[PDB]
Amino acid sequence: GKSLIQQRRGKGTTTFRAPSHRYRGAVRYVPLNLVQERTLRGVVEEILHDPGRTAPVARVKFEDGTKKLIIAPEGVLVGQEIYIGPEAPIAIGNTLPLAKIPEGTYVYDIEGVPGDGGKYVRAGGTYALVVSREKDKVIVQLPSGELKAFNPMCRATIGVVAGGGRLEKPIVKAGKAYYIAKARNRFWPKPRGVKMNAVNHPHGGKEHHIGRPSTVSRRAPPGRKVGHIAARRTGRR
């Protein structure tokens, strides 16, 4: 047979690769081996649009001189001072370890293991809520609804991510979707498999119908996982 789009993406060609030379650099906090117990102070000097991020970024200058990018919280002002460390107050924009953050607080940009730079709750308008503290684990509610435990020495920042409500307004036109997809080299426009030929898709054929259940096993081989992969249920409710 012939190949699927999901199999051609793995090769790593220009048709599928992200254009990250266009973006502002990655976003990471500060390494522990240089913020051990110091509680660094910085000033916000710019707020910027980032094409690969979905959230606005801010440029912070620290005392030594080092400049860095952070993910911006709703409300942060140009000319405002932020604090990074263990003896930092509880104020929107400051980064502390989870063991020092009360219950009921709204939190973003949480590390998975301490020192990893930030992994969780990064998108526009997202927030996490601190649920429980113990001496071995801190339980947090993630935006998917799921409860997860972290090490109490993992770092998080206080507040909500900026850029929410993005999907309140319709895209309306195909051309606007063209530009939105081109910005991150997403595959657009998308084809249907039932109007492909049989050489091209497990659906496919001149009568344009799936002729077998669209639920497919978790153990099926590649080239065959299309439709509803390992579905617990299907339908309306």
Partner RNA sequence: GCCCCGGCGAGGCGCAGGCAGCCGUCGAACCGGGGAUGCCCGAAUGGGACCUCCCGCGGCUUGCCGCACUCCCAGUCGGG
Partner RNA sequence: CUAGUACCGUGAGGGAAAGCUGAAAAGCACCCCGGGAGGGGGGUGAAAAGAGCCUGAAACCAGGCGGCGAUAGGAGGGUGCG
Partner RNA sequence: GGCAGGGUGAAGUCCCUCAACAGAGGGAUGGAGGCCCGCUAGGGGUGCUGACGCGCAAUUCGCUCCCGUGACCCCGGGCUAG
Partner RNA sequence: GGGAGUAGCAGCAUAGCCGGGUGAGAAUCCCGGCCGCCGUAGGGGCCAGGGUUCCACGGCAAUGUUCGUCAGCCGUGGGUUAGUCGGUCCUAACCCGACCCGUAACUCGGCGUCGGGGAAAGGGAAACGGGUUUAUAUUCCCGUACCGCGGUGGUAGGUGCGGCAACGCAAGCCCGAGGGGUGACGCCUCGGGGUAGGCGGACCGGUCCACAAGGCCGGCUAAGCGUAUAAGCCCGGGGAGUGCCGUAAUGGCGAGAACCGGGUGAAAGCGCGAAUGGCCUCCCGUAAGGGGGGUUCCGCCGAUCCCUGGGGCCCGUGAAAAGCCCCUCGGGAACGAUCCACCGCGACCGUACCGAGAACCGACACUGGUGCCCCUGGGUGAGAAGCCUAAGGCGUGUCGGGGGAAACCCAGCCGAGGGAACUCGGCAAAUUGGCCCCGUAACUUCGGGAGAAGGGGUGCCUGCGGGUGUGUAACCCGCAGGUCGCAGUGACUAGGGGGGCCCGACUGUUUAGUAAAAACACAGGUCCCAGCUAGCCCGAAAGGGUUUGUACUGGGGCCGACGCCUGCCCAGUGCCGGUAUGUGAAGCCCGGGUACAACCGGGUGAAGCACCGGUAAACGGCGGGGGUAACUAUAACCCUCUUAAGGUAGCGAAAUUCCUUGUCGGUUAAAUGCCGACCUGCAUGAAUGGCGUAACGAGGUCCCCACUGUCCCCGGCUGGGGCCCGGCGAAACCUCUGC
Q: What's CA 197's distance to the chain center, in Å?
A: 36
Q: Smaller CB distance to RNA: residue 39 or 49? A: 49
Establish if 187 lies at the interface with RNA (CB under 7 A). Answer: yes
Establish if 197 lies at the interface with RNA (CB under 7 A). Answer: no
Q: Smaller CB distance to RNA: residue 37 or 173? A: 173
Q: Smaller CB distance to RNA: residue 38 or 119? A: 119
Q: How far is the CB of 85 from RNA (least distance, A)?
A: 22
Q: How far is the CB of 119 from RNA (least distance, A)?
A: 4
Token digits of residue 46: 């710019």
Size of the site for RNA (CB under 7 A): 99
Q: Which residues contact 145 (CB under 8 A, 6 or more apart)?
A: none
Establish if 171 lies at the interface with RNA (CB under 7 A). Answer: yes
User: Nearest to residue 157, comparing CAs of 107, 120, 118?
Assistant: 107
Q: How far is the CB of 100 from RNA (least distance, A)?
A: 22
Q: CA 33, CA 66: separation in Å to the nearest integer?
A: 16
Identify residues 202-231 at the interface with RNA (CB under 7 A).
Answer: 203, 208-219, 222-223, 225-231
Q: CA 12, CA 234: separation in Å to the nearest integer?
A: 33
Torsion 4-5-11-15 (CA) sign: positive
Residue in 75, 178, 197, 198 binding RNA, rule: CB under 7 A:
178
Identify residues 14-73 at the interface with RNA (CB under 7 A).
Answer: 14, 16-18, 20-27, 49, 51-55, 65
CB 45 within 8 A of CB 60: yes
Identify residues 87-146 at the interface with RNA (CB under 7 A).
Answer: 112, 119-126, 142-144, 146
List alpha helices for 96-162, DSSP H. none
Q: How far is the CB of 76 from RNA (least distance, A)?
A: 17
Residue 15 burial by Cβ neighbours in a 10 Å radius (0-12, 13-18, 19+):
exposed
